[PDB]
Paper text:
APP is initially cleaved by β-secretase to generate a carboxyl-terminal, 99 residue-containing fragment, known as APP-C99, which then undergoes sequential cleavages by γ-secretase, releasing the APP intracellular domain (AICD) and β-amyloid peptides (Aβ) in various lengths. There are mainly two isoforms of presenilin, PS1/PS2, and three isoforms of APH-1, APH-1aL/aS/b, in human. Here we report the cryo-electron microscopy (cryo-EM) structures of PS1 and PS2-containing γ-secretase complexes with and without MRK-560 at overall resolutions of 2.9-3.4 Å.
The PS1- and PS2 complexes were then each incubated with MRK-560, which was supplemented at a final concentration of 2 mM, before cryo-EM analysis. The 3D EM reconstructions of the PS1- and PS2 complexes treated with MRK-560, short as PS1M and PS2M, were determined at the averaged resolutions of 2.9 Å and 3.0 Å, respectively. PS2M adopts a nearly identical conformation with the apo complex, lacking the characteristic anti-parallel β-sheet and the extension of TM6a. Among the MRK-560 binding residues in PS1, only Thr281 and Leu282 are not conserved in PS2; the corresponding loci are replaced by Pro287 and Ile288 in PS2. Remarkably, the corresponding PS2 variants gained increased sensitivity with IC50 of 106 ± 27 nM, 57 ± 10 nM, and 25 ± 4 nM for P287T, I288L, and PI287-288TL, respectively.
Author numbering:
A (entry chain A): 34 to 700
B (entry chain C): 2 to 244
C (entry chain D): 7 to 101
D (entry chain B): 85 to 113, 169 to 263, 362 to 448
The structure:
Amino acid sequence: NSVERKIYIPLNKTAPCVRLLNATHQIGCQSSISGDTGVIHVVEKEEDLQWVLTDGPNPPYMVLLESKHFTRDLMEKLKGRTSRIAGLAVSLTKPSPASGFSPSVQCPNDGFGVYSNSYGPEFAHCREIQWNSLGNGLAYEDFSFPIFLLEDENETKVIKQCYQDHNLSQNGSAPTFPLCAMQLFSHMHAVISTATCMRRSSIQSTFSINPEIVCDPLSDYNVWSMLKPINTTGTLKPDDRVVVAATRLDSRSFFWNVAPGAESAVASFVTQLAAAEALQKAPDVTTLPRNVMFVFFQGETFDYIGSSRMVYDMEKGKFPVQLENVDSFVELGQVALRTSLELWMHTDPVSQKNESVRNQVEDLLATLEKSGAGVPAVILRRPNQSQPLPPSSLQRFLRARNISGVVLADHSGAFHNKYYQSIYDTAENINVSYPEWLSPEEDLNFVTDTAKALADVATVLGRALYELAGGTNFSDTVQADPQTVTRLLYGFLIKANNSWFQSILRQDLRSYLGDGPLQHYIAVSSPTNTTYVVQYALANLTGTVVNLTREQCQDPSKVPSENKDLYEYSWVQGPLHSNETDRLPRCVRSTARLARALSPAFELSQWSSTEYSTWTESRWKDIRARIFLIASKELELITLTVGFGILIFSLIVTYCINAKADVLFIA
Amino acid sequence: GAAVFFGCTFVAFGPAFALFLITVAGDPLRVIILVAGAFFWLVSLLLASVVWFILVHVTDRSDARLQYGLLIFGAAVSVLLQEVFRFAYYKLLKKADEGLASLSEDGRSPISIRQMAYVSGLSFGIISGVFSVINILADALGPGVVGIHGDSPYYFLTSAFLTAAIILLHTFWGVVFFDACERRRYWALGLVVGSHLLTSGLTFLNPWYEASLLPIYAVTVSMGLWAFITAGGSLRSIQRSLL
Amino acid sequence: SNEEKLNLCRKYYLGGFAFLPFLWLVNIFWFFREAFLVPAYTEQSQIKGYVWRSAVGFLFWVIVLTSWITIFQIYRPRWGALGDYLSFTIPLGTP
Amino acid sequence: AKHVIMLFVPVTLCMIVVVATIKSVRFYTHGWLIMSSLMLLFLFTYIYLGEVLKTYNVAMDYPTLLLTVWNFGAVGMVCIHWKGPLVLQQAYLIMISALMALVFIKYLPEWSAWVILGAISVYDLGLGDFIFYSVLVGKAAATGSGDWNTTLACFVAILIGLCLTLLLLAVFKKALPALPISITFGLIFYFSTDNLVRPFMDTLASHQLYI
Ligand SMILES: *[C@@H]1O[C@H](CO)[C@@H](O[C@@H]2O[C@H](CO)[C@@H](O[C@@H]3O[C@H](CO[C@@H]4O[C@H](CO)[C@@H](O)[C@H](O)[C@@H]4O)[C@@H](O)[C@H](O[C@@H]4O[C@H](CO)[C@@H](O)[C@H](O)[C@@H]4O)[C@@H]3O)[C@H](O)[C@H]2NC(C)=O)[C@H](O)[C@H]1NC(C)=O
Ligand SMILES: *[C@@H]1O[C@H](CO)[C@@H](O[C@@H]2O[C@H](CO)[C@@H](O)[C@H](O)[C@H]2NC(C)=O)[C@H](O)[C@H]1NC(C)=O
Ligand SMILES: *[C@@H]1O[C@H](CO)[C@@H](O[C@@H]2O[C@H](CO)[C@@H](O)[C@H](O)[C@H]2NC(C)=O)[C@H](O)[C@H]1NC(C)=O
Ligand SMILES: *[C@@H]1O[C@H](CO)[C@@H](O[C@@H]2O[C@H](CO)[C@@H](O)[C@H](O)[C@H]2NC(C)=O)[C@H](O)[C@H]1NC(C)=O
Ligand SMILES: *[C@@H]1O[C@H](CO)[C@@H](O[C@@H]2O[C@H](CO)[C@@H](O)[C@H](O)[C@H]2NC(C)=O)[C@H](O)[C@H]1NC(C)=O
Ligand SMILES: *[C@@H]1O[C@H](CO)[C@@H](O[C@@H]2O[C@H](CO)[C@@H](O)[C@H](O)[C@H]2NC(C)=O)[C@H](O)[C@H]1NC(C)=O
Ligand SMILES: CC(C)CCC[C@@H](C)[C@H]1CC[C@H]2[C@@H]3CC=C4C[C@@H](O)CC[C@]4(C)[C@H]3CC[C@]12C
Ligand SMILES: CC(C)CCC[C@@H](C)[C@H]1CC[C@H]2[C@@H]3CC=C4C[C@@H](O)CC[C@]4(C)[C@H]3CC[C@]12C
Ligand SMILES: CC(C)CCC[C@@H](C)[C@H]1CC[C@H]2[C@@H]3CC=C4C[C@@H](O)CC[C@]4(C)[C@H]3CC[C@]12C
Ligand SMILES: *[C@@H]1O[C@H](CO)[C@@H](O)[C@H](O)[C@H]1NC(C)=O
Ligand SMILES: *[C@@H]1O[C@H](CO)[C@@H](O)[C@H](O)[C@H]1NC(C)=O
Ligand SMILES: *[C@@H]1O[C@H](CO)[C@@H](O)[C@H](O)[C@H]1NC(C)=O
Ligand SMILES: *[C@@H]1O[C@H](CO)[C@@H](O)[C@H](O)[C@H]1NC(C)=O
Ligand SMILES: *[C@@H]1O[C@H](CO)[C@@H](O)[C@H](O)[C@H]1NC(C)=O
């Protein structure tokens, strides 16, 4: 309409606070239906909170913060007085807070690890070390008003300009009643817990036509591959041995689709991909006495979705690698910072009370130190006290078998990450920065010092996996190059629409590469951006090319060579031939398969469960925001009074002229 | 919100609902005259929009002042086509009065001609007010008012008071128009179309409410006085009607 | 006629025993000016009772239904799973 | 004269129910007699009552809606197929026509629903005339942006063709199709005010102009 453009300015670059659900609690935010409307008041000091909490003439406000004031204490002050705050727009600060910020809890993944009151009770609720020392738990609270993140500076300037135009107070008096306001729309369809929401979504999908589904389980696919190919249609022999290298693949933040995850997620699976392509280029790979499984777990933030699904499928015979076949386990945690060239080796102390398990873990650590003695830029250390294990994917495997596992990390005590699970864990947190006179095609091939730092960790990991797989002769050829590391860092942290990501994905998957960086949240969308990019990156870094046409590549069964049970086949795009648009497509013959990652409390249908991570996301509709002016209630009562008066006066005058129309209008 | 909606609706459709409820809705013959008047006004608006469509797609939408000139010319030719099809509806009612009376009815007068003038004017008024204000009234149900880009916050109320004046002006213009067409007086026939052109031109000063709303009600009061004395009323008839 | 008036009124009153109070409401609305205004019929004796006991019967459905609706609208979130299995539509955000 | 308003009032109320459903619900955006009336007085009342309760987000239990729908479909069956009040007789025929016209709005494509209507008028009151009058106005209040000018110009166009059809049988005095005059003025005036008058209104409304 041409009149609504005179009334409303929409807000475009935003990010909402979304309700998620647990077995017992709810988190996130919610508005009312048809939005929450509030008068804008900016906050830049502590006197501006008294205007909203006590001194406001127009009580339902909607405040505007810089995100350096988005603190636990100010949230307690806004939550204790809820009838005067309806809405909250948080603006992103480009000089990131120097004290750090982490909205996750003080001890992440608490009741879903090994340590409980029955196994490790001196280490149970992380009594020794608080791992996330800067965590203030704010992302697991429940708010009654919306909280949106403003990502553009120009929209913040427009809102502040409308505040300066209309909402000020002259000479210590009231603001003049035409005032600027803002309306936030985030209405969540879900309720008290995931048991109530899954029940309400199953009743409406059974006893009701036009089914009202009001939740969705958090789910994605894990991505795994083998060094030497396995059969994948049966199970392995009981006397086969694999070496598992695992890493999480996701992150989150306070706000919904924002999840940069550079230090906590991105650098770790980038260096596992580099170690995989370093291990695959060994000349003695086919005649190894053992095998290596690279696995990338997704869902690890929300109480180990993918790792628990992998262990559950592994102990029900539904996965080709059995839990007896797991010989050694090398978990790869946060390795991005490494403040003094040190890479700490975390082990589990309670399972080492068995004497043979302790001998196997000591042999594993001796193997790691022997393979890391050839890299002078990595100083492998172990913690001085018998401290517990950090929250990692090994803790799901240690609830079943007591495998000989190690966790590599950059920290001994608490995290070196000042922005764990936050909006500030971007490429500048791990110092991935490029010079300004380079084209973005040349920024793809520029080597950061972070890339040279992570390629050394990838080299140590690759030579360690080569020694655990019984290689022992061509141990010097295994070395990751920083070229692949800096291309993966530029692809996952800066620009997903590369010239290299396009030449490795399929034609159908080219819309999964946006203009900016990838966000690493485990969405309801059952394959994510990141799962496809990691799968096809692993397919190019581990697979080879074969001469097949596309009709032979979609169906390799009639080929006399090129077995289908052992490998997997994909018809990918190619690089560009010059001066035209010639994608040159080809087959990749790799082992990068996918496995489902949906937590086993959703397959067993026990939605009030205390051991398989019942996390769901609310469904919604119509996330939008807008600013406008409001009129006084004096003017609304005046226009309603004038309308009633015109109507009643018109009825009286019309009936008094109609009744005397025989006399008034003579002929 | 609801207060602005139910206030601006009762200003725009305050007189028109009163006239339709008290005068028109009783007789089952006047509703047909009402819907036929609304139909001929729709045909007038369609034939007026054809000419503006052709002009705006011939002139290629290049210059900004020429589009404003074509806007003024389209408003002028729309006013002229409304006043032509009012004469068309007068000719159709005069042709349909000789057939309804004294040839299909014994008594020669089922409805007079002044009543058909009144109902034709009210029909033009109601359909023009519906196409004037009903899209504006849908935006009054929102929380916001006009003025985020430096406009006036009295947009809705002034649109209601302009719509009500347009309805009353059509209701008066119908009576004065048909009595001018009866007695073969053509100087008043120019004054009706000149007052229509004048009240359509005064909405070109429209963001300045001090001179685009008060002369329109001045014309409305003068045209109501002329439709009163035109239909037969006088002070002799007013002051001897209070028994 | 009037013989097929009472003989159609009794077929309205004997049909409201099949959980039909609105049939009793249209029995009250339609046969009211023919049972309390003009004494003219011999069969006016039983047209005055079939519209009186059917207004007792209709008011009986008002006391039950407006109590049950308020009891459901209050005690629905207090009831647990059972409040969801006998709810036709459940509102979205509120529990 | 009186018998024309006796055909204006039922066709006005049938369009008010449909237009207030399209603009508010946002979801539509004796063997052959009784059996096909049990499928409309019970199976379509169960959907129409249930879909309008979802719009306002209110809780309703099964024992009240099963009491409400049964008090609508059984009185509707005993007033049509058996004797009843005349005011309640015609009111149910308004209500079953609007329900039968709302299923002709949802389950049709955009440019395909004009095919059916077109062919019907081309080869053409009774219950069939109340439906396809209501389909035309409900389709006009759905396609496009917010435009109340196009909905209310198709309302006047149907009432003129309904006026001229009754006037046309004043000389002929024979059963007429009634449809191909009102739908012809509906096919013209919808495609003539949705894209030809609608730009002329918006330029006048942007500068706040009044003709
Ligand atoms: C589903 O997801 C939700 C969202 O996180 C989970 O909810 C959280 O569950 C935690 C369970 O451990 C809750 O932590 C407990 O909170 C208790 C209440 O403490 C109050 O909170 C303030 C905060 O500073 C405290 O100072 C006060 O003491 C208050 O009482 C604590 O009592 C408890 O801490 C105990 O400390 C003693 C000290 O000796 C220990 O012996 C004891 O073992 C325990 O550690 C603990 O901190 C957490 O508050 C809660 N979050 C919210 C927002 O409610 C659900 O548990 C999840 N459901 C599942 C997984 O099934
Ligand atoms: C959000 O994006 C919309 C585009 O859909 C912007 O609206 C446009 O704003 C410019 C500048 O005021 C106008 O010239 C256009 O006419 C607007 N287009 C519309 C209303 O469809 C809007 O300004 C953006 N919001 C912010 C805060 O930048
Ligand atoms: C993993 O190792 C621990 C420690 O060796 C095992 O825990 C022991 O269990 C036995 C019998 O179940 C008991 O002696 C004690 O409960 C534990 N001994 C300790 C803690 O010293 C545990 O059973 C092993 N297996 C699994 C699947 O966890
Ligand atoms: C992840 O993949 C989805 C699916 O292709 C991307 O969503 C598309 O994004 C483009 C660019 O904004 C839009 O034009 C499309 O309409 C979107 N499609 C869908 C189905 O949503 C998404 O951008 C990708 N994420 C990132 C970070 O690149
Ligand atoms: C990803 O990059 C490609 C090019 O590398 C973009 O494709 C171009 O898109 C523009 C805009 O639609 C077209 O005009 C060009 O013809 C495209 N092809 C080229 C330059 O070869 C693509 O749009 C980008 N994707 C996203 C989501 O930004
Ligand atoms: C992985 O993708 C890269 C994309 O550049 C491939 O590199 C090019 O491959 C072609 C052969 O198809 C060579 O002619 C080019 O010289 C390569 N460019 C380089 C190395 O910069 C690479 O071959 C792909 N991996 C595999 C195994 O095919
Ligand atoms: C464009 C508009 C504002 C012009 C208004 C002109 C007015 C003031 C003029 C022009 C027409 C005039 C009328 C013409 C004829 C008659 C009939 C006569 O028996 C009494 C005077 C009376 C009723 C005149 C009064 C004054 C009058 C109404
Ligand atoms: C808006 C900007 C771009 C241009 C403003 C131009 C103004 C000053 C011009 C353009 C159109 C003009 C109007 C055009 C027609 C009429 C009708 C006539 O009977 C009286 C003068 C009047 C009412 C004019 C007044 C002056 C006017 C409003
Ligand atoms: C802010 C000051 C200094 C300058 C602007 C003054 C504006 C807002 C004032 C001055 C004149 C006023 C108008 C004067 C007369 C009328 C006619 C009445 O029926 C409705 C209100 C209306 C249309 C007023 C609306 C508000 C108005 C336009
Ligand atoms: C913000 O506005 C400035 C000034 O118009 C512009 O240069 C800049 O590109 C804008 N930022 C974005 C992200 O569009
Ligand atoms: C395992 O490999 C053999 C090859 O000898 C193949 O025939 C068989 O289909 C595979 N899968 C099983 C046994 O599930
Ligand atoms: C120690 O581990 C070995 C191998 O896993 C197992 O055979 C042995 O039973 C364990 N010791 C005890 C006491 O269970
Ligand atoms: C490399 O070492 C292995 C022992 O694992 C041995 O079997 C093999 O013969 C050696 N190869 C060469 C070329 O020395
Ligand atoms: C590879 O395939 C192409 C065509 O598919 C064929 O011409 C070529 O001979 C093949 N090469 C080998 C070594 O089989």
